[PDB]
């Protein structure tokens, strides 16, 4: 599995099309995570997502974004190469376990976690990359309370051709809980503000240590969102993609203050929260401006919240590539990685 240069420790996850084990580099002793992606070239959409992920990760160099530390070279003939091994930063837990466990989660924990999330997000949005699928299970953390953003299978970027119908109908299992309203309602406004909606959801979830908008189904999700944010505005309703969603929403009979949603919460925390959770994307705060909000004064540092240049190009992802060309690009990605340190 891991060749001679690593040693396996324990399995961290096995479901889905990947195994995640913790390991140690034999020569250095550094601990890492090894992700096996089996049958990585069978399902064109899977291989596309994988190539997407490898490129996004190789592009980012940022302490709050998981880094690729090694990619195992193909140990079998090209045509026989079917399992991809990606070595990543080993983290100790994820924000979900923290929120839904027996461990401390003080307002200072919440403040520092939010700070690192928004710092990663500032660097990431400056590269024209939208994560689109943020959630506590996607935020990795260690003992010191350091946070790293991961995954990225769902990241897309700023251009949205009439591939908005693609967003119309896609699979989201338990993942509509943080899905931005513009995606729930296909408002055809797909920018980095998407992520900010989720951040708000995550923020409140740290505050009360319970999910904010836990819809049991699509319609229930919309109903929950509305019971708090109040009836959406005329313009929003008119921008909804599917006439049927519009009709249901119009066939419905006010916003509840956030001090009432989270009675007794840090004033500044709820200030930021309210700046995040709004229907109109344009009305949300940017990651950059959030980092300057009073709630984060403890950690704000303008010389240590860098943008990322150059921006990230999704052209490779936009073109329809055969299975073969996708596999070719992934192998080229591995070799390129080994061409930029090891
Ligand atoms: C030590 N342990 C008992 C506690 C624990 C619990 C959860 C996480 C971690 N740390 C960690 N460090 C590095 C990485 Cl990279 C990951 C990781 C999580 S999820 C994932 C992925 O890519 N996909 N997931 C979806 C389905 O397939 C595989 C998983 C990669 N986690 C530690």
Author numbering: 50 to 302, 305 to 393
Reproduce text from the manuscript describing this model.
Currently, the abnormal activation of RAS-RAF-MEK1/2-ERK1/2 signaling cascade has been confirmed in more than 33% of tumors, and it is considered one of the most important drivers of malignant progression, invasion, and metastasis of tumors. The co-crystal structures revealed that SKLB-D18 occupies the ATP-binding sites of both ERK2 and ERK5 simultaneously.
The co-crystal structure of SKLB-D18 with ERK5 revealed that SKLB-D18 also occupies the ATP-binding site of ERK5, while a significant bidentate hydrogen bond is established between the 2-aminopyrimidine moiety and Met140. Additionally, the morpholinyl and 3-((dimethylamino)methyl)phenyl group are oriented towards the solvent regions on either side, respectively.
